[PDB]
């Protein structure tokens, strides 16, 4: 069979940087070749494994995540960084095997005047540990401020939908990777 990467890549809406769409996935066969024959992203940076290799390697579980950031801010998403999204909203674990995809969101997440519905978490009582989620608005004020998504702003301040993958064959069984 398969299992629908569509609902994260080919979806409509987008989750915030603190409330982000976490999704364990398993018992599949996944045509990463689809991820390739898409040819629509901006960046497809793959840690601990090369895109051809993650095809022919055992996968027990996945941890797909869907959200958005402001363009430049995508730099924050890497092992060992600081910033709003880098620490105060997420963190890329340093035992990692999955890998990251991201691309512009202009005619889906922007418009004249801009969009507001996206809210970061600018402060925090605790910089979100690897992969953790503080979906509240705890004080440190409630730090969740929006970002403007304007066609005339900086391109690094244009909205970029990010979708991350995170693989885990700890000891869990088979049924991923396709072939």
């Amino acid at each position: 069979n398969l299992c629908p990467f569509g609902e994260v890549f080919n979806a409509t809406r987008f989750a915030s940087v603190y409330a982000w769409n976490r999704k364990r996935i398993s018992n599949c066969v996944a045509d990463y070749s689809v991820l390739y024959n898409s040819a629509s992203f901006s960046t497809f940076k793959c840690y601990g494994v090369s895109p051809t290799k993650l095809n022919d390697l055992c996968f027990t579980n996945v941890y797909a995540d869907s959200f958005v950031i402001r363009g430049d801010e995508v730099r924050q998403i890497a092992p060992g960084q600081t910033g709003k999204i880098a620490d105060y909203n997420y963190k890329l674990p340093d035992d990692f095997t999955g890998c990251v995809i991201a691309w512009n969101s202009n005619n889906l997440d922007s418009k004249v005047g801009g969009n507001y519905n996206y809210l970061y978490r600018l402060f925090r009582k605790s910089n979100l540990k690897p992969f953790e989620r503080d979906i509240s608005t705890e004080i440190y004020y409630f730090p969740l401020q929006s970002y403007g998504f304007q066609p005339t702003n900086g391109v690094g301040y244009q909205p970029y939908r990010v979708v991350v993958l995170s693989f885990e064959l700890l000891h869990a069984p088979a049924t991923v990777c396709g072939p």
Partner: antibody
Amino acid sequence: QLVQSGAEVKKPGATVKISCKVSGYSFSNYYIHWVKQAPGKSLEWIGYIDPFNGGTSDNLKFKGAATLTADTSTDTAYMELSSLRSEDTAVYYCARSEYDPYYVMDYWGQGTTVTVSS
Amino acid sequence: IVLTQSPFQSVSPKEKVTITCRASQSISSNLHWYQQKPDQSPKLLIKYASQSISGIPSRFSGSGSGTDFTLTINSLEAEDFGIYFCQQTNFWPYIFGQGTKLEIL
């Protein structure tokens, strides 16, 4: 400024590794692109490595197992090309890159040919 | 994301000679352009197709709309021309068009 290895020639079947060392800024905080330059033809992108993690976004077009590794100790990136073969007798270039999606390759290595014969 | 800008050039120098980056269906606002010299590691000329980086004489300007972009080398002489490659962007395999060699009288 970037510095490669000298010009090289090899056999089919086996593999090779090439390198590129960096000077003048914070290496660990700047991508490095690897670009193939054809023999008497156009260009072709082959990948890039982040210096700090295996940010090896790898163009598929040729899957000669073109693996990228690096080292922040000596500030040198390594391109491990496998399956040396006819389509590879070209000039490979490291290239200075933006750290994230402002990608431009403006500072380069000397360019190294990797000739393939019998 | 295939590019097919301009096979080569053959024109009197000193003129406003245009090389026409015909982008495929993918309208990417971003781009780049690099100057190549014979057996010389090329260097990016036009950053983001509109901004100038430090160290470029203003002989060749870059512009364009959506997908289709252009580079107008204004008043180019017999001292500067070589090959000129176009550099795609965000679309994942950052393909490079088959370039723009520049020959002149």
